[PDB]
Amino acid sequence: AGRIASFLKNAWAKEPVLVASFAIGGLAIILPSLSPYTNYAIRINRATPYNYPVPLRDDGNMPDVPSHPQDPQGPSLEWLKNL
């Protein structure tokens, strides 16, 4: 507790560049795992339609697939507009 205190004191006095570098690196490593928005970034990446959405052949047993884009079934991007 007091060993590391004087150690960080001497480091801030002699090598502030290395101190700032290790602080920034450690923050970059640990902060992304505590964030509620990392999942938002994954979802944003998943919602980007790079290729054509190929339709499915209706067999009468697909209650949760839309038959027109403006039908209520399927994924919604409403969460994204309010983001």
Partner 1 sequence: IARTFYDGPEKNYEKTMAILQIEAEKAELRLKELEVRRLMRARGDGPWYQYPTIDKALIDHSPKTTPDN
Ligand X SMILES: CCCCCCCC/C=C\CCCCCCCC(=O)O[C@H](COC(=O)CCCCCCC/C=C/CCCCCCCC)COP(=O)(O)OCCN
Q: How far is the CB of 49 from partner 1 (least distance, A)?
A: 11
Q: How far is the CB of 32 from ligand X (least distance, A)?
A: 13
Q: Which residues bind ligand X (CB under 6 A)?
A: 11, 14-15, 18-19, 21-23, 25-26, 29
Q: Which is nearer to partner 1, 5 or 50 (CB)?
A: 50
**For residues 15 and 71, what is the distance between their CA atoms, to the nearest angstrom?**
62
- With a CB cutoff of 8 Å and minimum separation 6, the contacts of 72 are 66
Q: Which is nearer to ligand X, 27 or 62 (CB)?
A: 27
**For residues 11 and 16, what is the distance between their CA atoms, to the nearest angstrom?**
7
Q: How far is the CB of 36 from ligand X (least distance, A)?
A: 23
Q: Which is nearer to partner 1, 14 or 57 (CB)?
A: 57
Q: Are 19 and 7 in contact (CB under 8 A)?
A: no
**For residues 69 and 77, what is the distance between their CA atoms, to the nearest angstrom?**
13
Q: Which residues bind partner 1 (CB under 8 A)?
A: 51-52, 54
